[PDB]
From a paper:
Here, we used X-ray crystallography and cryo-EM methods to describe different oligomeric structures of a syn-copalyl diphosphate synthase from Oryza sativa (OsCyc1), and provided a cryo-EM structure of OsCyc1D367A mutant in complex with the substrate GGPP. The structure of monomer OsCyc1 consists of an αβγ domain and a catalytic center located between the β and γ domains. OsCyc1 catalyzes GGPP to form syn-CPP, in which new bonds form between C6 and C11, as well as between C10 and C15.
The tetramer is composed of two dimers that consist of chains A/B and chains C/D. The tetramer molecules correspond to subunits A/B/C/D in the hexamer. Apart from the dimer interface, intermolecular interactions also occur between chain B and chain C, chain A and chain C, and chain B and chain D. Interactions between chain B and C are mainly located on helix α22 and involve residues S620 and D615.
Numbering used by the authors:
A (entry chain A), B (entry chain B): 80 to 767
Write the structure that this text describes.
């Protein structure tokens, strides 16, 4: 119903600097800082109160929806050391210490990459702080020795001055780091004095330098939460992109266009010639957010250039980090290859290079269980990434994608890896499922009835007097092609018109093939168009377009012409007439653009038709590859012409062309045994 | 000057039923008819007076510009028998009789086909009528015996009832015929009671049946000439077609458009589903007038169908007469093959059959002196028919044709064969030469100066910084291509614009080839367009079209695309902008037609470009023939789209496309060694 939509809208108008689950680990360090003015106790007890409030039934601390030793142990350690250092509420320390001691051994049995960032860097400092309290603690553990060895390895791996000159990710986790400067390192924080926007690093920093720039930041965050802090703040750009991405993939973006373009222009104003980070001011930038923003901004008529990607290339390779070549995960390259589809022909080839590198890197590991990310856990990655690597941009239909994603969006059941298991709900909410699924279900139920309506219409016209193989399957497929490009209820007019004239042209093409052609013509077929229920105004235009199509049928005879582009042009003209829209006065650029679009459509149709023709003759595949490249070029070109926010022509008028061409390419790029499958899944196979 | 034009216009508004040289032979028979009311003398003495007035210095009768025995003798015979039968002015009979007697022998030395119609049929009756007067006459002559033998041959060749039932040409010359009926033959005259619209046959007919329908006809003709009659009357359709044909070929038709379309709609109203004759009411119809009218009517947006030609086909042959298969002359098949060019693709193949039959029949006899007609004598047929058989419709430029015809139109120095040497001046006048030649000469002198203007412009721009082989010849050829499609002085704007942007695109294409392509791009060439002198309004549109062409240049790279259709589309757009015209509101049919034209142009350009490419590689000629057929089909189609008088779009907007495509085909269908020849002949080689 609507209430979900309205709540989501109002919550979406209220985009703050961030919405993430409040962490406890960092709060514990916040408690460790005393009162500034030589006070008697800690700086802020609100954190303390928050801590006492949320003692687990097993005394632990952390998200209950999951169970992770490496994180529970650190949360418990930080809490117990904080409260007992300040020597208060010792009973809770006792309550948790039993679980601590009895769980001390489970750590040796963890997963491969489920290893928190600097996890082996804080834990040493953790037990160090502990040995001042020095309770009963089995410090004796080979796991401790292993992480110690890795500590020494990475310490021998890191420089001193490059570390003191070049701002790197290590500044995110510097508290477990020692043996440092405070002036050469002083300037390597963010615009707000935060080091990598992480509160723990800055808190430990202020512990050794009273720069008010850190105090004001922390005070603001603790004064905006009143007990509790996250592990990273803020995440404006991150959530901004990641919400609109879902709302596009969830097929509900039809309603929130205003707020959508609001966050869009925000990102645009904050766009850099160098890349993007989770926040506006973080100097170090990564590739994944950059690519995602690139894709989304292009997809809405914003002029950007992709040579910014020339920073994440590594001399014939690509690595998500700028300066670090570590084995990347699936998601960054996934979004990269995705954004690598909408290439405009006037752009540098770095996009193509990244595309081929990415597809190579992905297809191999696809067959195995390599879909495990190092920094997030979702419901089902493999299916999504597989379909993505399967159905290119030119063969993508919106409804089938949203249907597939309806079982691949996890909602709340996800977690995000950081220094602690955190989760965001602003865009990982679950009411999104209710809204989208209700919408899709009613949409299905509407398509179901209009289907039978069209069925009885088609039977009334006795069109099978010159039918095909069987009218049922083909009429189903035809109406499905229309329904898949337009799902809004208020356009069933254009929907049914499309389907009807499609069936018509099919029938007459069949009849013409069966008799040989227009030399064997006998009947007045320019009246056959009347079989469509006509309005008062929509009559004459259609008959004119129909006679035009017939004249084309005449002229295309005796030659080696194809007969498809004619049909596509007829289709777009008719869809427009049914949409009841005109063009304006027609300054020369306007009709120039129009004719350009039409010529592109006709050419593409002829080309891929001939390709299919050769495909059926067992032709040598190299020819198929040649023709595929050929259609690809003008495909990209047409897309660029449709996606220009500077166009003088209307928008819907543009996307119509896309609808038709995508329909044709799709139906020309799959066996029916998949088409019917998709058909039943989207129509008859019901949700909820 | 203008006075010639105005006189020709006023004379052309006054189209009568016919304008032909007055004959004397038929007048003589008119004199032979007595007064109807049992009068004392002949019916009309005005003929007699006319006769006495025009006694030749040698007493003979006939056109002095020529000397033909077979006709002079018959004229003299008819005159002397008439005047002396009525026994008046005998001295003139004596004056002519000496030449008669001394010339009696020259007849045995005539030409092959220079044999008047029924010449051997009237002469027997002539000497028969003479032997009543029976003066000194050497009736003894072997030539008389030869024509007598042929008389008997043809008399044994002709039927009786078919002759009495089927109206045939013999009804034109029936006076030398005897042994006849007067009722079964009675109905075989024209609508006006005239037999084949010839006065002699009808006069001899009334001699044996006093049908007033003949008396009124003859009275009208003698009352409209007041002394003297032709050998055939009237010739409305004949002269109507034959004048506008010249005015089209003479390149002056620009001025008389009104009267032109007046006679056109006249012919249209009088158009039959069966064919045409010299006049409106003659039931027997021939092929030559039919084909000529067909061609001219189609060439002005009139919808006619050519199955009317299925009457003149003879089971795999064609013969000008319907029912008679006699060895045809050059002219009828010449005009037939000519009209056989503008074939619309939706038509029956009778046109193609006639085309191949005609070209076969013509090309052989071309090499010999077979250009002699049996019924007319012109200045130079061979050159004209040769050029026609050489340069097809798709390779025809108007100016070169009018220049060639300026030395192939004889004017008055021609004669027309009938029962007597007759001549028409309404369309064979000579002031037409003065007007056309003056026009062409001033046109030449204007082109000469604008040439130097463009020369100094092209030098000012230093365009040769990236030139070609040599700028002179190529710039000449380019400007020539423009000047040859537009000769009106008031369009030098479009002329120079065309030439300038042509030179531009040539230069940039050269530069792009020389550096490899747009990957090696260095300069901002979308500013290079500024080098043209721009107006206030014509600036922005051109820069837009130019950047469009550049984007095309970008997209067409790395593929097997051609780069010609882009240039042609740029050219037409620019010519239109310079012409300063828009399209209207743009109802869907309008822009539909527009885009159709543009797509056709692009396709044709690509195709013939690739053809030329293969041509230079010594490719197997069969491929060239295949590609030639391929371009031919869409060539015909495009022509049909341009020549539709039902179009919603403007006319000039249409013919522009034709101009461009014809330019391209022509330049792609001749060695330069002919191009430069034509160039000098039309520009530097001066008329008068």
């Amino acid at each position: 119903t609507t209430t979900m939509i309205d709540g989501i809208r109002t919550a979406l108008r209220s985009i703050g600097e961030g919405e993430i689950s409040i962490s406890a680990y960092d709060t514990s360090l916040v408690a460790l800082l005393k009162r500034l003015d030589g006070g008697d106790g800690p700086q802020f007890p609100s954190t303390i109160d928050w801590i006492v409030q949320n003692q687990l039934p097993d005394g632990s601390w952390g998200d209950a929806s999951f169970f992770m030793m490496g994180d529970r142990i650190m949360s418990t350690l930080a809490c117990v050391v904080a409260l007992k250092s300040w020597n208060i509420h010792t009973d809770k320390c006792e309550r948790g210490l039993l679980f601590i001691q009895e769980n001390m051994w489970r750590l040796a049995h963890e997963e491969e990459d489920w290893m928190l960032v600097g996890f082996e860097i804080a834990l040493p400092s953790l037990l160090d702080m502990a040995k001042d309290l020095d309770l009963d603690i089995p410090y004796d553990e080979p796991a401790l020795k292993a992480i110690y060895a890795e500590r020494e390895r990475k310490l021998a791996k890191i420089p001193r001055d490059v570390l003191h000159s070049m701002p790197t990710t290590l500044l995110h986790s510097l508290e477990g780091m020692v043996d440092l400067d405070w002036e050469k390192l002083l300037k390597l924080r963010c615009l707000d004095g935060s080091f990598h926007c992480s509160p723990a690093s800055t808190a430990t920093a202020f512990q050794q330098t009273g720069d008010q720039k850190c105090f004001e930041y922390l005070d603001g965050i603790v004064k905006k939460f009143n007990g509790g802090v996250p592990c990273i703040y803020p995440l404006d750009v991150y959530e901004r992109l990641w919400a609109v991405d879902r709302l596009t993939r969830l097929g509900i973006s039809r309603h929130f266009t205003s707020e959508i373009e609001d966050c869009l222009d925000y990102i645009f104003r904050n766009w850099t010639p160098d890349g993007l980070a989770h926040t506006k001011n973080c100097p170090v930038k990564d590739i994944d957010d950059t690519a995602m923003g690139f894709r989304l901004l292009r997809l809405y008529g914003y002029q950007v250039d992709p040579c910014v990607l020339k920073k994440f290339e590594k001399d014939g390779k690509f690595f998500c980090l700028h300066g670090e070549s570590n084995p990347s995960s699936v998601t960054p390259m996934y979004n990269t290859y995705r954004a690598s589809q909408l290439k405009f022909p006037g752009d540098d080839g770095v996009l193509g290079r990244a595309e081929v590198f990415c597809r190579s890197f992905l297809q191999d590991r696809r067959g195995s269980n390599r879909m495990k990310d190092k920094w997030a856990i979702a419901k089902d990655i493999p299916g999504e990434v597989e379909y993505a690597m399967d159905y290119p941009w030119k063969a993508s239909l919106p409804r089938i994608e949203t249907r597939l994603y309806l079982d691949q969006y996890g909602g709340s059941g996800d977690v995000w890896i950081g220094k602690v298991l955190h989760r965001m709900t602003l865009f990982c909410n679950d009411l999104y499922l209710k809204a989208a699924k209700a919408d899709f279900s009613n949409f299905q139920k509407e398509c179901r009835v209009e289907l039978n309506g069209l069925r009885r219409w088609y039977l009334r016209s006795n069109l099978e007097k010159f039918g095909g193989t069987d009218p049922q399957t083909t009429l189903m497929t035809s109406y499905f092609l229309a329904s898949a490009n337009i799902f809004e209820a208020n356009r069933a007019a254009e929907r049914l018109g499309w389907a009807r004239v499609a069936l018509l042209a099919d029938a007459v093409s069949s009849h013409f093939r069966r008799i040989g052609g227009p030399k064997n013509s006998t009947s007045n077929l320019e009246e056959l168009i009347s079989l469509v229920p006509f309005d008062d105004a929509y009559s004459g235009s259609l008959r004119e377009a129909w006679k035009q199509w017939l004249m084309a049928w005449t002229a295309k005879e005796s030659s080696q012409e194809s007969i498809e582009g004619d049909t596509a042009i007829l289709l777009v003209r008719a869809i427009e007439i049914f949409g009841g829209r005109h063009v304006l006065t027609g300054q020369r650029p306007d009709l120039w653009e129009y004719s350009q679009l039409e010529q592109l459509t006709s050419s593409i149709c002829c080309k891929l038709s001939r390709r299919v023709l050769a495909q059926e003759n067992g032709e040598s595949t190299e020819k198929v590859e040649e023709i595929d490249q050929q259609v690809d070029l003008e495909m990209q070109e047409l897309t660029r012409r449709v996606l220009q926010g500077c166009s003088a022509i209307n928008r819907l008028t543009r996307e119509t062309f896309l609808h038709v061409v995508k329909s044709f390419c799709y139906v020309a790029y799959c066996s029916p045994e998949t088409i019917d499958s998709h058909i039943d899944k989207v129509i008859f196979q019901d949700v909820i």
